[PDB]
Homo-oligomer: A and B are copies of this chain.
Amino acid sequence: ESADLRALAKHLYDSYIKSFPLTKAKARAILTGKTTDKSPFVIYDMNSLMMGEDKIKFKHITPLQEQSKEVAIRIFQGCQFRSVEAVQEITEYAKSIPGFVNLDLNDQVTLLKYGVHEIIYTMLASLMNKDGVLISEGQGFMTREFLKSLRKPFGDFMEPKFEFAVKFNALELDDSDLAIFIAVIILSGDRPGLLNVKPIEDIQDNLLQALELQLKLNHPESSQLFAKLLQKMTDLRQIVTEHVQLLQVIKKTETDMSLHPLLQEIYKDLY
């Protein structure tokens, strides 16, 4: 029923505000200059990278860990710490999706293990434009061209996220749209190894109707936006399959890699 779906939508948005400190609206205010506080330091090369860390003089122990390597490894290493925080944030949000915590525990685990990267790329787009990406709570900006320039495999991790972002961003979703899209991703009844598919699909279906109504109301002039958004779920899946192949390239071409423990769990025997 409409009132039910509108109230589902407001719940997820409210909870999305509570779970994700840097929302699209705040990322864009920062991207755009509209903010009034502190303009982000841009990293375009080795020297400004050095200075970007070396900002640690009127800056602090930047929540990540410590670095005994080179540029390409060090950047991939700062990506891991951020994706670990994103996973925590996304798990905290999932628990608020009505019906999620009442599911079989193994199913909750599998839903998260498969959904979490799709959602990291979805929301990474929020922080991106065609020239670069906001990093460190919006205190920095790394250029697309710098990330793309990185030695073979590392450089290969970056570009396809930017090509995705540019296209997803042209859909002009805002946070309240995104909040339902991401819950829809989480509640995917076709993740490998699910014990109890139907009660997951029943929830997804109801999220789907809510996302539908939210796009009609919020973007009345935008034709077939709902479909165009669900088409994006396959751009997402292909980013993940690509990312995973690139991860295998990293075991071969690199010395001691071993991701953060929680990410190794995520990647352990994945699709």
Contacts and interface: CB of A to CB of B under 8 A. Distances in A.
A270 B270 CA distance: 37
A196 interface: yes
Contacts of A63: 104-105
Contacts of A84: 95, 101
A127 to B, nearest CB: 17
The A interface is mostly helix, strand or loop, or mixed, namely: helix
A62 interface: yes
Interface stretch (A85-93, A144-152, A177-185): A85-93
A55 interface: no
Interface in A75-126: 81, 84-85, 88, 91-92, 95-96, 98, 101-106, 108-109
A91 B261 contact: yes
Nearest to A65: B105
Contacts of A109: 18
A262 interface: yes
Contacts of A96: 88, 91
Contacts of A25: none
Interface string A53-76: 000000011111100000000000
A246 interface: no
Interface residues of A, number: 32
A171 interface: no
A200 B60 CA distance: 16
Nearest to A102: B85
A59 B109 CA distance: 22
Interface string A240-271: 00000000000000000000011001000000
A95 B96 CA distance: 13
Contacts of A196: 60-62
Contacts of A102: 62, 85
A50 interface: no
A108 B101 CA distance: 21
Given A81-B105, A84-B101, A105-B17, A92 B262 contact: yes
11 contacts: A14-B105, A18-B108, A61-B196, A62-B104, A81-B105, A84-B101, A88-B96, A91-B261, A92-B261, A92-B265, A95-B262
Interface of A: 14, 17-18, 60-65, 81, 84-85, 88, 91-92, 95-96, 98, 101-106, 108-109, 195-196, 199, 261-262, 265
Given A61-B196, A84-B101, 17 more contacts: A14-B105, A17-B105, A18-B108, A18-B109, A62-B103, A62-B104, A62-B196, A63-B104, A63-B105, A65-B105, A84-B95, A88-B98, A88-B261, A91-B96, A92-B261, A92-B262, A95-B262
